[PDB]
C-alpha cells in the first residue's frame, strides 16, 4: 500500500511516502509563539507557528526547537509538529498508513516509549517502527559494509556495519553538530562586530554557515593566508539588505568538527572518533571498514569535508591501507532514501509493531530487536 | 445598530456614524470666550462659542484650544465640545449608541481615566472604547503590515505593525505637529513685517500654511532659487482684503518637519524617526516595513511630502531595498475611516467596555488590552 | 580710536562715544512741522524741528514720531534725526568713526536692510553694526546669565542668556510700552475731565506719568484706599500754571503692564511673559534664570516696579526658588552703557561690517551672526 | 613608580593612580556641543564640554555618550575624554606612567586595536594593557573563585573563575544595563504624565533611578501594595524646584533586570544568566561557584538586589546547595580597586605591552594572553 | 632498617613502609593538565596536578591515567607520580630505603626494564625488586596454598600456588576490571538519560559503582524483581546536589564480571577462569585449590561477590568437593600487607637487586627468578 518515512531528528523534518525518490515534505521543525505581546486570542490571531510559517514570519516569534540533542524535550510541542506534518503538509490521513520513525542511538528508553505511545494513542497509527538513523543511511548506498559516520543538527554518531550485521558494542555518539557550530559561529562573528542574539538571528547564522563556510584542507596554512591576504574574504547580504564581510571566520566554524576543544567539548574530533570506533573493532574487519567509510547528513556537506577527512584519517591508520570516503551527492536525504528502500523491502514486513501487539504486550515491546 | 466614531485629537473633531464613507461632523474644536468686555449675561449674550461659531465670529473671542499636545488640559471646556458634538452637530441621542474614542500613544493614564469617567458619568454612554490612532489608521488602507507614520495638529507618532500584530516596544512619539509649524510660521513671517499675535490671527496663519506652503524637494537648492528669482513668490488675500506676499517662507515651514532643530526641538526629524523605529525592530521584519510605509493625518498633506520622504529615507536605508510610501488621497480622514471599519467589524464586538463592567470593576478596566 | 553708540529706539535717541560713563546726547527724537499755517519759506522760517527744539517750541508743531513699535516708518524723516544727531548735537564728523546701531528683536528684515543702506549710502559710515538691545543690556551689569526683561517706549522683549550663549528660540516680543501707557493715561484722565487730544498735549501726559505714577504693590487694595481716602491724591502743575489733581489714575497706568487686557491687548502681562519665556527654556537652566532676572529701560523705572514684579513672579514659580530681580540704578542708560562696553571690547573688533564688505557681498550681509 | 588604572567603560570614567584606596577622578564621561546656536567661535565660546562641565552646564548641550554598549563609537570624541582625563583632571604627564585600560568581554577586535593604537600614537603611553573588567573585579574581594556578575551602564557580563583559572567558554554577555533601565524609566514615567525627552532630561531620570528606586523582594506582591495603598509612594524634587511623585514606577525599573521581556529584550534575566553560566560549567565546579557569587558595578547597588537575587537563584538550583551572594560595600569601585591591586602586583610586570613591542610586532600583539 | 612497598598498579597508588598494618599513602594516581586554557605559566599557575589535588580540583582538568591495562604508557607522566609519592606524600628520602615494586603477570619485558631503569637512574634507589601481585596477595592470608583470584582497576589474573611453589604454566590474565565496569556503567546509565562524557564525570561514575552497586545472587531473578517493583531502586546525590535514581543498572555492572560477553569481550567470566585454571592443573592438586580459593583487590569488594562466586563455581566442579571462598576484610590492602610481610621476611633479604649488580650485569638482571 504505502509507508510514511519520517526523519524525525533535530532540524529539518523530512517526511513523505516510501517508494519515492525524494522527500515530499521538508521544513525547519521549529515552533514559534508571538513574542512581543500576549496573543489577541479573541480576534483569532493564531498563537502557534510551526514549520514553514515560523521561518516565513520569523521576526516576531520566539522560535523554540522541540528536539535538543536528539532528545525530545517538549512533548506538548513536538506533537504539534507531527500534527502539522500529517494533516497540513502531506495531507495524508494517518490512521491508514504505517509510519517508520527514526532515532539516534543511545537515546534514553523513555524517549522511545513516549514517542511510541503518542503515535499509538493520539494519531492512532495502524503500525509503526523506530529505526536507527545510521543503519538506514547505509541502505541508501546499496552497500552492506561500512562505517556510517552520520552528522546532523543535533547528534553525531558512528555505526560500523559488516556483512549486514550490526555491531552494537562500537556505536559511538558525540554531542557535536550543526547547532553547536551555529552557536560557535555566533560567537566568532562578534570578533567582526556582528552580534546575533535572538533565536530569529540564529536562524540567519544557520544560513550563513550553509553557504559561506567551507572546510580548510590544511587549517594552519589557511590561518596564514587569511592573515596575509583577502582573496579568502567573501561577502553576504542580510534580509534587510546590509552586507556582511565574513573573512577569517569562514573556515573556522567547520574546523570545530575536527577540534572539539574549540567549543569547550573535551572529545576526539570526528576523525579520531571514526578511527577509535574502527580500532575498537576486531582486527579482521578493519581493512574492510577503511574501504567503505560512508558519510551522511548535513554538516557533512561542507565543500571539501571528504577530501580533508580522508587525509586526516590517512594520517592515523597504517599506510598500507587504502582509505576511500564514500560521500555521495544528496547526503542530506541519505537517511530518508534508506527509509524509502527499507520500508518497501519485502523481508521487513514482519518487523512492524502492530498496534494490537503494543496494546496487549505493553510498552516494553518497543525495545525488541528481532531484526 | 450604530457606532459613533470620534477623532478626538487636537484640531478638528471628526465625528459621525460608522458605516459611512466620510465624517458627518468636522469642526475646529476651539472654545472661545468674549475677550473685550465681560459678558452682558443679563441680556443673554452667549458667553461660550465652540466649534464653528467660534471661527465664524473669530475676532471678538479668546480662542483656547482645550487639547494641547494630545493631552486634555481643560476638563470643564473639553466637555463643552463633546456636548456640542452630540447634541448640536450630530443631533444624536448619546445614551443609545456606542462610542469609539481615539487617543495618542504614550499618554498619561490619568487622561484616559478622566476621558472614560466623563463619558460614563455625564453623557451616560452605553458602551465605549479608547483606541490608538495609528492602529486605526492602518485598517483604512486594508493593509495588515506597515509603519504608520501619523502626524496631526498635536502629536506625531509611529506605530509599526506586522501581520496584524502590534509591536509595543517600538512606538515613538514626537511633540512636533501643525501647531508647532504654525507657531514657527508666525515667527518667520515677521521677517517680512507681517506680525500675527492674537489667537484669532493664529487661526489665519493656520490657514496660510494649509494653502500656500509646499515641501521643497531639495531644501538647499530652493534656498538658492528663492534668493535669485521670484517665480517662487506667491500672494494671498487676508479677510480684510489686504494682500500678503509670502515668498521664501512658503517652504521653510514644512522643512521643520525634517529638521526639528529649526524649532529648538532637539530631535530626529520624521525621516530619522521612521528609520529609527524600523532599525529598532528585528532584522527579519525590515524588508516588509520598507515596502508598506503608510502616512496619515494633516501635516502630511503638504504637496510632495511623500516624494521628499521617500528620497530622504532612501538616503539612509540600504540601496537593495525598494521603498514605497503609501500616501493615499484623503489622509485627513484615514483615522476616521479606520474607525468606521473597525467599529463595524464583527470580531470587535467583544472588546466594548460595557458601562456595567466599568461600574463594577473600577477605572483600571480601561488599560486592559485583550485586543 | 572711537566708537559711536546709538540707542536708536523709539523715544529718546541716546548717542555719544564709547569709552564714556553716560550718553553725551539725549533728546526726544520727535520731528515737527508747523501746523497752523503753511511755512513762510520765502522768509526762511525753518519748516523742520527735530529733537530738542521741537519740544521747546512744542505748541505750534505737529509732532510725529518716526519710529512706531520699533519699526522705522518714515524714511525721509528718520534720516533727519540721524542728520541732527551727528552734525548738530555731537558735532562729530561721521565718516571717521564706526557706529554701533541697535534694534529690537524680531523686526522685519527690510528695516535692518534700509537702516544699513542709509548709513553706508548717505552718511558714508566707515564701519557699522546692528546689535540687539537685550543682549547689550546684559553687559551693562557685568553678568553673563539672566533673563533680560527690556521695556521701552515702543517694544517690550525678553532675551534669556546663559553662560554668554544666547537662546534664539525663546525671545518674546510684546507690543506694550510707554506709548501705550501714555495712550491709556490720556483715556483714563478724561474720567476727571482733563482731556488731552493733540500730540503736544500727549507730550505733557508723557511727563505726568514719569513723575506722578507709581506701581501699586497690591492693585486691589489700592483700589480700596483710593476710594475711601485721599492721601493717595497728588497734584501737578501744567505749563500754563493750572493745577491738575490726578488721584486714582496715578497707579492704574502702570498696572496695564501686568494686565494687558486693560488696553485691549490680548496678552500675558510682563510677569507672565518672563515666566513663560523661562518655562519654555530647558529645566536645567531655570534655577539660574530665576536668580539673575535683570530689568532695563524706562517703563521699568516706576517706583516699586521691581518689588511688585518679584512678588508676582514668586506667586507663579515654585516656592523652593529664590527670586532676585536685579534692577540697578540708571536702567535708562543700561543699553547705552552696554554699547559703551561692547564697542570697546577687544574681541568685538572682528564683527564690524566694513563698508567694502557690504559693497561687495550685498545687503544680505547684515543678517550674518558670526557673533 | 606608578600605574594609572582607568575604568574606561560607559558612564563614569574612573581613573587615578594604583596604590590608592579610591579613584582620584570620577566624572560622567559625557561630551556636549552647544545645541541652540552655532558656536560664536570668533569670541572664543568653547564648543566642547566634557566630563563635569557638561553636567554642570547641562541644559544648553547636546550630551552625546561616546561609548555605546561598551563599544567605542566616536573616535574623534572619545579621544577628547582621554585628553581631559590625563591633562585636566589628574594633571599627570601621560608619557611617564603605564596605563591599565579595561574592556568588556566579547568586544570586536577592532575596538581593542583602535583603543591601543591611539594610546601608543597620540598620547605616546610608555606601556599599556587592556584587561577584562570581570577578572579585575574578583581581585577586589581577594577571592580566587566565584562567578563575577558584573553590571554597568552599558554591558552586563558573567565570568566564572576558579582557582585563579579563567574559563573562556562560559563568558556570557547581555546588552542590558543602566542605560536600558533609564530608557525604560523614561517610558514608564509618562504613565504619570512626566515626559522627559532631551538628553539633558535623561541625565535627570538617570538620577531619579539612583535614589528613588529599590528592588522589590516579591514583584507580584508589591504590585498589589502599590495598588491598594500609598505608603510606597515617594517624592523627589527637580532642579527647577518642582516636585515629582513617583509611586508605582519606583520598583518596576529594576525589575527589568530579572525580566528582560519588559524592555523587549528576548533574554534570560540576570538570575537565569548566572544560573545558565553555572550549569554550562562542569559538575565538579558548581558547588564552589554557588558559594562565591560576587557582584560588581552600579545597577547592582539598588537596595536589596542581593537579597532578591539569592532567593531567585535559590529557586532554581538544588536545595542541598547553600547560596551566598557576596555584595560588598563599594561595588561601584570594585573594578578600579582590582586594577589598583593588579597593577601593583609583582608578578604582573611582565605582561605590559611595551610600546617598542607593539611598534615592531604589529597590532595583532594586543590579543595575546600569556597571562 | 625500612622497606617501601608500593602497589604501583592502575588506580590507587598504595605506598608506605613495611612493618606497618596499613598503607600510609593512598591516592588516585591520576595526572591532570588544565584543560580550558593554556597555562598562565608566567604567573606560576601550576600546570600539573597529580594524585589528590587532581581529584580535589577535578572539573578543570584533563585527567589522564598513566597506567592502562597494567602497562605503563606515559613514561614522562608516571615518573611524576613516583616523584609525588616519595617527596610530597611520604616525605621520605628515597636514596635511603629499598623499594619493593609490584607488577601484573605476563607483562611485556620492556615495561619491567623501563620501570627498573628509572628507579636506578633518576631516583637512585639503593636496592629494588619487582614482585607479582598475586603471590604477595597470598602471604597476606598466611596461607601457603590457594588460587589467588586478583582483580583490580586494570588487570584480573589468577595465580595458583601450592605448598609455596608457584605454578607458572597456569597463570591466566584477563583484561577485565573496574575500568571496564566503569566504561560499561557509563554506557548503561544513558538508558536513564544520565550521560557522563568527560574524564571528570568518569571519576563520578567510578564512585557511583563503589557505593550503589552490589552483585545479584541470581541475575535472572533480579532482572524480574527490578522490572515488577521498585524496592530495588536507590538514589544518590551528585556533587552539585542533583539526585540520581539508578534502579536496574545497580546490579548489571558487576554482572559483566561473570558475563564478559556483555562488554564485547570474548572470554570466560571470572568464574570460568578460576575453574579453567584449576582444571589445567594436575588432578592431585585440585581438591586443595577448591578449599583455598582466595580473593583480593577491589572489584572484589562488591557486596555478595563471594556468595555468588561460590555458588557459580559450585555449579561447575564436582559435588563431592567442598568449595570455600576466602574473602577476608580489607581485600583492598591484601597486596600491600603481603608486601609489608614479605619485605620484612628474613629469608627475602638475598633477593634484592642491588644497584651495583644491575649496573654491572645489565638490564637482563631483572628477569631472574632465584626466588
Ligand atoms: N548545504 C549545506 N551546507 C552546510 N550545512 C548544511 C547544508 N545543508 C544543511 N546544513 C546544516 O546541517 C544541519 C543538519 O541538517 P540535517 O542533516 O537536515 O539534519 P537532520 O539530518 O537531523 O534532519 C543543519 O544545521 C543544516 O543547516
Ligand atoms: N490640506 C492641508 N494642507 C496642509 N496642512 C493641512 C491641510 N489640512 C489640514 N492641515 C493641517 O493639519 C493639522 C492637523 O489636522 P488633522 O489631521 O485634522 O488633525 P487631527 O488628525 O488631530 O484632527 C492642522 O493644523 C491642519 O490645519
Ligand atoms: N523716570 C521715569 N519714570 C517713569 N517712566 C519713565 C521715566 N523716564 C522715562 N520714562 C518713560 O519710559 C519710556 C521709554 O524711555 P526709554 O527707555 O528712554 O526708551 P528707549 O529705551 O527706547 O530710548 C518713555 O515713555 C519715557 O517717558
Ligand atoms: N547608588 C546607585 N544606585 C543605583 N544605581 C546607580 C547608583 N550609582 C550608580 N548607578 C548607576 O549604575 C550605572 C553604571 O554605573 P557604573 O558602575 O559607574 O558604570 P561603569 O562601571 O561602566 O563605570 C549608571 O547608570 C549609574 O547611574
Ligand atoms: N568498596 C568498593 N566497592 C566496589 N568497588 C571498589 C571499592 N573500592 C574500590 N573499588 C574499585 O576497585 C577498582 C580497583 O581498586 P584497587 O584494588 O585499589 O586497584 P589496585 O589494586 O590496582 O590499586 C577501582 O575502580 C575502585 O574504584
Ligand atoms: Mg539526519
Ligand atoms: Mg489625527
Ligand atoms: Mg530702550
Ligand atoms: Mg563597570
Ligand atoms: Mg591491586
Summarize the structure.
The structure is a homopentamer of 371-residue chains. With 371 residues, the first copy, chain A, is an alpha+beta fold.
Give the topology, please.
Five copies of one chain form a homopentamer.
Chain A lengths: L3 E4 L5 E5 L7 E3 L3 E4 L14 E2 L1 H5 L4 E4 L2 E2 L2 E2 L2 H16 L8 E5 L5 H13 L5 E6 H7 L6 E5 L5 E7 L2 E2 L5 E3 L3 H11 L10 H13 L7 H10 L6 E3 L5 E3 L3 H10 L11 H11 L5 H5 L2 E4 L8 H10 L10 E2 L7 H9 L10 E2 H7 L10
The site of one magnesium ion has 6 residues of chain B, from loops.
Q: What descriptive keywords fit this protein?
A:
alpha+beta; flat; 13 helices; six-stranded mixed sheet; Nucleotidyltransferase, domain 5; homopentamer; about 375 residues; Actin, Chain A, domain 2; binds adenosine-5'-diphosphate; binds magnesium ion
Task: Provide an overview of this structure.
- It is classed as structural protein.
- Keywords: Cytoskeleton, jasplakinolide, azobenzene photoswitch, stabilized-actin filament.
- The assembly is pentameric.
- The entry is titled "Cryo-EM structure of F-actin stabilized by trans-optoJASP-8".
- Chains A, B, C, D, E are Actin, alpha skeletal muscle.
- The structure is a homopentamer of 371-residue chains.
- Chain A is an alpha+beta fold and 371 residues long.
- The first copy, chain A, has four domains: 127 residues, Nucleotidyltransferase, domain 5, CATH 3.30.420; 41 residues, Actin, Chain A, domain 2 (Roll); 110 residues, ATPase, nucleotide binding domain (Nucleotidyltransferase, domain 5), CATH 3.30.420; 89 residues, ATPase, substrate binding domain, subdomain 4 (Actin, Chain A, domain 4, Alpha-Beta Complex), CATH 3.90.640.
- Chain A has a six-stranded mixed beta sheet with strand order 3-2-1-9-10-19, with helices on both faces. In chain A, strands 11, 12, 13, 14, 17 and 18 form a six-stranded mixed beta sheet that branches.
- In chain A, α4 packs across α12, α5 packs across α6 and α5 crosses α8.
- Chain A is flat, with a radius of gyration of 22 Å.
- Chains in contact: A-B, A-D, A-E, B-C, B-D, C-D, D-E.
- Chains A and B meet through α6 of A and β13 of B.
- The complex binds adenosine-5'-diphosphate (5 copies) and magnesium ion (MG) (5 copies).
- One magnesium ion binds next to loops of chain A.
